[PDB]
């Protein structure tokens, strides 16, 4: 009887497609036209950070916009002082396979985890004086791709197989688990309020999850290839996704389809990372072509090129206050553009 | 700068020196990677070398050369999103079992386990990340193949077979197939030693292959290639 259920599901999907097609009133390009262009945004490297020895896979900015955590294939988790290029800490890790790193909003905990399919929580402000392991979260049957902090107690981990977990730190247990992705979930971005988070998998789908409830309210499928990085808008109205098909699409939660696409003929590489500048005029996208491109979010135009790296610009990030953008690459460098 | 600033920069300097010494002590350790179907004695080889845990690392040394060995068999994730972390690996140890040419495990209507390992080897060897990394190919059950070829010929697995049903000829045929799977012959080489419950031979071959590959890498980096 699976044929009847399958055809009913197909009919309902057709209903969804018809609904979203009917909701499309006018293109975002037409409405956004007649606005003042961004102009040639000039970006110059204020100061570079050196001391790693392998490829940097992840970086995260503190809420003070002054501290910076960097992860590398070398078993080091350096905490940087952005203003003065001083290394605050040097955290050795049990596994030298790191694919994500997070910095707690309170500034007390740092989480890293990679192919060792376990998330390690570190205490920075320790009474003794050295960085100690607080909790070694285990229970994911796959490499962690992105770990993020809701607060000092809850952490959301982008699993390797199909799932996401709302781990709590006090006890080694998962409060709720998220299923529904048909591929390896890679990116995970949190809303300005820690009530919704969107995730992208290696199956060309993005799902908006309700953290408190535990269900996928909306699903977004506009791309054709794997989704690598997702970043929310300054508000929770929309978000942008980067794919391996040399495109970045701005999806809208309220309207429930894609607003504008960001692609150019000269670009044939992938999107390693993506982030929004404050106030959301500029969309900063990392590329496999060893460069970062400054995309105007409102109008699909290239404001400028952030070209100061040798290799893959794996990790990218903009400070919460908004002064500077820090880009890390596969060479042991991490430059703070502004 | 203030007194706090001098102390902070001194702390940064000592952290930098600790990082440099850790990197210099880590750069002298040979890194290796293992791939196999899962029933190809990879665990058996790992146990022999010593004499949900997605990544497994084993330390061992031999003739004053530290060896880093990583096992990725228990991952169960699509290979593309994590295979680029192992770009600087000195060599890749590919374990394929020559005994189980027949006896498919996944689906009887599907191809043999030898064939699945053949596609795995082709994908790894022709990968764009491993364009300069050698493979130390391994064959696992020397004796099991010997005692199974007598009852069943090599023709039950390959239609284009033409040689006799002897041990040496069948071993040569399988070896030659796995050799000619490679497409960039100049940059990388295949070592293909035969081991089955033999002591002092596996580690000796690994050491010889590692010395050869490090010598060739030194020549390439020293303007003599």
């Amino acid at each position, epitope marked *: 009887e699976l044929d009847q259920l399958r055809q009913e599901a197909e009919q309902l999907k057709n209903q969804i497609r018809d609904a979203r097609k009917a909701c499309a009133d006018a293109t975002l390009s037409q409405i956004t036209n007649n606005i003042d262009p961004v102009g040639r945004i000039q970006m110059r490297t204020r100061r570079t950070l050196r001391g790693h020895l392998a490829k940097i896979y992840a970086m995260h900015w503190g809420t003070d916009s002054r501290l910076l955590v960097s992860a590398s294939q070398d078993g080091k988790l350096i905490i940087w002082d952005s203003y003065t290029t001083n290394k605050v800490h040097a955290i050795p890790l049990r596994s030298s396979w790191v694919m994500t790193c997070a910095y707690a909003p309170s500034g007390n905990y740092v989480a890293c985890g990679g192919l060792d399919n376990i998330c390690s929580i570190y205490n920075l402000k320790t009474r003794e004086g050295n960085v100690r392991v607080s909790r070694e979260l285990a229970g994911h049957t796959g490499y962690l791709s992105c770990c993020r902090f809701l607060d000092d107690n809850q952490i959301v981990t982008s699993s390797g197989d199909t799932t996401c977990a709302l781990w709590d730190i006090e006890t080694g247990q998962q409060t709720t688990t998220f299923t529904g992705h048909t591929g390896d979930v890679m990116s995970l971005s949190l809303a300005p309020d820690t009530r919704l988070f969107v995730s992208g998998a290696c199956d060309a789908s993005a799902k908006l999850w309700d953290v408190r409830e535990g269900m996928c309210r909306q699903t977004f499928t506009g791309h054709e290839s794997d989704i690598n990085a997702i970043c929310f808008f300054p508000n929770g109205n929309a978000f942008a996704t980067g794919s391996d098909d040399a495109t970045c699409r701005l999806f809208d939660l309220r309207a429930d389809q894609e607003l504008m696409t960001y692609s150019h003929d000269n670009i044939i590489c992938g999107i390693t990372s993506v982030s929004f500048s404050k106030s959301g005029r500029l969309l900063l996208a990392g590329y496999d072509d060893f460069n970062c491109n400054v995309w105007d979010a409102l109008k699909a135009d290239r404001a400028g090129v952030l070209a100061g790296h040798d290799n893959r610009v794996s990790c990218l990030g903009v400070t919460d206050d908004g002064m500077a953008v820090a880009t890390g690459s596969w060479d042991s460098f991490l430059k703070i553009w502004n | 700068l*203030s007194a706090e600033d001098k102390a902070a920069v*001194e702390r940064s300097k000592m952290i930098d020196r600790n990082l440099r010494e850790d990197g210099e002590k880590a750069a002298r350790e040979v890194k290796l990677l293992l791939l196999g179907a899962g029933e190809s004695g990879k665990s058996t080889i790992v146990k022999q070398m010593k004499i949900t845990t997605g990544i497994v690392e084993t330390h061992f040394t031999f003739k004053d050369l530290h060896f880093k060995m990583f096992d990725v068999g228990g991952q169960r994730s699509e290979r593309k999103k994590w295979i680029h972390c192992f770009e600087g690996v000195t060599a890749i140890i590919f374990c394929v079992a020559l005994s189980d040419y027949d006896l498919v495990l996944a689906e009887d209507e599907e191809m043999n386990r030898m064939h699945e390992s053949m596609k795995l080897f082709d994908s790894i060897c022709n990968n764009k990340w491993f364009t300069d990394t050698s493979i130390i190919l391994f064959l696992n059950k020397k004796d099991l193949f010997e005692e199974k070829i007598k009852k069943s010929p090599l023709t039950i697995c390959y239609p284009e077979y033409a040689g006799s049903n002897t041990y040496e000829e069948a071993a040569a045929y399988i070896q030659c197939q796995f050799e000619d799977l490679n497409k960039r012959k100049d940059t990388k080489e295949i070592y293909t030693h035969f081991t089955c419950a033999t002591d002092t031979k596996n580690v000796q071959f690994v050491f010889d292959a590692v010395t050869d590959v490090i010598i060739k890498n030194n020549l390439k980096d020293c303007g003599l290639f």
Partner: single-chain antibody, 233 residues
Framework: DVQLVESGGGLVQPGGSRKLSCSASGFAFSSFGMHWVRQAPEKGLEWVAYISSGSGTIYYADTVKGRFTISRDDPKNTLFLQMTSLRSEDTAMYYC??????????????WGQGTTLTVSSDIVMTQATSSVPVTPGESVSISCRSSKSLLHSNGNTYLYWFLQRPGQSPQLLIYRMSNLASGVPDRFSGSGSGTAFTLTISRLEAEDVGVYYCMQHLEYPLTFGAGTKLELK
């Protein structure tokens, strides 16, 4: 937890020499710079030495510049302070003080217990007040002044506040100026600007009684205040 127990000291002839030693107890001693603070029998606090993490900077005082040697050894987690010539003004009880220095750091966290040694320009802090009588509970303010402004170009002032309860070792109350410390309750607070810095305490109890000291951390010849004794009439 962290326990520093310094030891070694008796009677010294007026001109002899002795050696002080403080033993750490499992708090990653090698990563902490260590100080040396002494207390006259009925006077305030001085500062006699400083050895950094890794024995890099060995700043001394202007009165023990040549006759004092400070050294550390990473094994056994011990700090040394060796005397060569002891005067009559060197009689005191010496405190070993831990100090860690980075961006979000709290210098002068743990103080030692003390060893009695009985022999038998620089910024000056006034602390003009000597005794302010207090009630079982009320709002009390402690003031301070500095010769040179401690507001560096970085944007932070470097005046610290310490409390020495009768018969105990000093602690840390506000580890910078207007930056509440750890292990100290929310009653304490600080606020200041320019060269005038003040402390405020909301509710009194049998824990705010003692002597309160100030300290600057701009120029390494560190100075303390005269102290403000609270008596709780």
């Amino acid at each position: 937890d962290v326990q520093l127990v310094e030891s070694g000291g008796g009677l010294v002839q007026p001109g002899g020499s002795r050696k002080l030693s403080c033993s750490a107890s499992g708090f990653a001693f090698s990563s902490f710079g260590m100080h040396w603070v002494r207390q006259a029998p009925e006077k305030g606090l001085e500062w006699v030495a400083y050895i950094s993490s890794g024995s890099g900077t060995i700043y001394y005082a202007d009165t023990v510049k040549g006759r004092f040697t400070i050294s550390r050894d990473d094994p056994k987690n011990t700090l040394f302070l060796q005397m060569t010539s002891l005067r009559s003004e060197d009689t005191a009880m010496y405190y070993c003080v831990r100090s860690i220095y980075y961006y979000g750091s709290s210098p002068f966290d743990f103080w030692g217990q003390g060893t009695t040694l009985t022999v038998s320009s620089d910024i000056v802090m006034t602390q003009a007040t000597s005794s302010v009588p207090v009630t079982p509970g009320e709002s009390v303010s402690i003031s301070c002044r500095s010769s040179k402004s401690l507001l560096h170009s970085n944007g932070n002032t470097y005046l610290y506040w310490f409390l020495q309860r009768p018969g105990q070792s000093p602690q840390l109350l506000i580890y910078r100026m207007s930056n509440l410390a750890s292990g100290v309750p929310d009653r304490f607070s600080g606020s200041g600007s320019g060269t005038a810095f003040t402390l405020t305490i909301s509710r009194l109890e049998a824990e705010d009684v003692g002597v309160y000291y100030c300290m600057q951390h701009l120029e390494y010849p560190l100075t303390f205040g005269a102290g403000t004794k609270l008596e709780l009439k």
